[PDB]
Every structure is written in C-alpha cells, then in structure tokens.
C-alpha cells in the first residue's frame, strides 16, 4: 500500500527478564512512531498518559488516549500475555467499525524511567505497526529520544512519521 511494511518480529528486540510487576502504572507517551502517525508541525498534539494495570491473572488493563488523538478520549483494552514475558496481544473485546488486534512487544525498559514498546497489527492485509516511547516523567533525555528515533529509522520509518507529543496527565 501507501504504508511502509512491518518488520519481521526477529528485528524487534525483546526486553530481557521482563518484570510485569515493575512495568505497571502510569506511563506518559513521550514519542510515537508508525506508518500511520504523521508529524504535522502546523498541528502539534498533546497526549494523556497511559495506565498499565497488572491484574491477578497477569493480564493488564491498558487505559490510553485513542487514535488519532483529536478529541481527548480514553479507551481500555486487555493486554493478554503471549508466548513469553514482555509479549502480549492487545485485543478489541467487541467487534466494532475500526477493529484490529495487536501484537505487543516490550523492546526495552528500565521500569523507573523509560520504556519502548512495539505494536503490530495481526490483521491479514495490514502493514500497520508503531513504536511508543514511554516515560515515567513527561521529560526524557536527549540520548533516550535519539535512541528511539534511530530504532524507528532502522525499521524504515521516515523522521516525519516520528511524533513527539506534549505529554499531559489527564484529558482536558
């Protein structure tokens, strides 16, 4: 299509010894890169924080601001553990107009500062993928943001498909 193809999974690193208990909580969206994310300097965006909640069954609740981030509205999905720690499927629980599931792979995190997470659509004829740069604070370092840009570019994403929203706590 118009879109840059998704990488094979083997090109997406997996965070080693992923600790679900240490990943839970609030994560600001500090960066988002994907074939369907488009930097428009004329239309900057702000994004509310994502909440990852670990449950008894080791799945998460995930509460996140909805795409394409025009009116701030939260949504909640289930993050079902996959083939191993760090990996999940994010499923739309009800069949609705815009519908796909995503494979979710935590690429790297140190739990208390940053995380980088890869999302790939499991729908047959969808190249759709994106990478989220999360921070525990609204601000991350230049080195951490350049590492996210380089990772994103290594999967073929142009720099104008890499967006840095203004992180906020809540919808307004």
Ligand X SMILES: COc1cc2c(c(OC)c1OC)-c1ccc(OC)c(=O)cc1[C@@H](NC(C)=O)CC2
Query: Using CA atoms, how far apart are residues 71 and 94, in angstroms rounded to an integer?
Result: 22
Give me the least distance between CB of 119 and ligand X, in Å please.
6
- Within residues 96-125, the interface with ligand X by CB under 6 A covers 102
Cα within 13 Å of Cα(24), Cβ side: 10
Please report whether residue 36 would count as binding ligand X according to CB under 6 A.
Answer: yes
Query: Using CA atoms, how far apart are residues 125 and 34, in angstroms rounded to an integer?
Result: 16
Phi, psi of 149 (to 5 degrees): -60, -45
Residues in the chain, how many? Answer: 172
Candidates 3, 9, 38, 75; binder of ligand X (CB under 6 A) is 75
DSSP state of 35: T
Residue number with the shortest CB distance to ligand X?
36
- Within residues 129-148, the interface with ligand X by CB under 6 A covers 130, 132
Please report whether residue 15 would count as binding ligand X according to CB under 6 A.
Answer: no
Please report whether residue 165 would count as binding ligand X according to CB under 6 A.
Answer: no
What is the DSSP track for 86-145?
TEEEEE-SS--SS---EEEEEEEE-SSSEEEEEEEE-STT---EEEEEEESSS---HHHH
**Measured from the CB atom, is 123 or 154 closer to ligand X?**
123
Give me the least distance between CB of 34 and ligand X, in Å please.
6
Give me the least distance between CB of 52 and ligand X, in Å please.
8
Query: Using CA atoms, how far apart are residues 167 and 32, in angstroms rounded to an integer?
Result: 11
Phi, psi of 115 (to 5 degrees): -150, 150
Please report whether residue 50 would count as binding ligand X according to CB under 6 A.
Answer: yes
Please report whether residue 34 would count as binding ligand X according to CB under 6 A.
Answer: yes
Interface with ligand X: number of residues (CB under 6 A): 16
Binding site for ligand X (CB under 6 A): 29, 32, 34, 36-37, 50, 62, 64, 66-67, 75, 90, 102, 128, 130, 132
């Amino acid at each position: 299509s118009d879109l840059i193809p998704a990488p094979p999974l083997s090109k997406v690193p997996l965070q080693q010894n992923f600790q679900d208990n240490q990943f839970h909580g609030k994560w600001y969206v500090v960066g988002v890169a994907g074939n369907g994310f488009l930097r428009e300097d004329k239309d900057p965006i702000k994004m509310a924080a994502t909440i990852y909640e670990l449950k008894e069954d080791k799945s998460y609740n995930v509460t996140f601001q909805k795409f394409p981030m025009k009116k701030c509205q939260y949504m909640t999905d289930t993050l079902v553990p996959g083939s191993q720690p760090g990996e999940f499927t994010l499923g739309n629980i009800k069949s609705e107009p815009g519908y796909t599931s995503w494979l979710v792979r935590v690429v790297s995190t140190n739990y208390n500062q940053h995380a980088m997470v890869f999302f790939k659509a499991v729908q047959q004829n969808r190249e759709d993928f994106f990478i989220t740069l999360y921070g525990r604070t609204k601000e991350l370092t230049s080195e951490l943001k350049e590492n996210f840009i380089r990772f994103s570019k290594s999967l073929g994403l142009p720099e104008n498909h890499i967006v840095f929203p203004v992180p906020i706590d809540q919808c307004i």
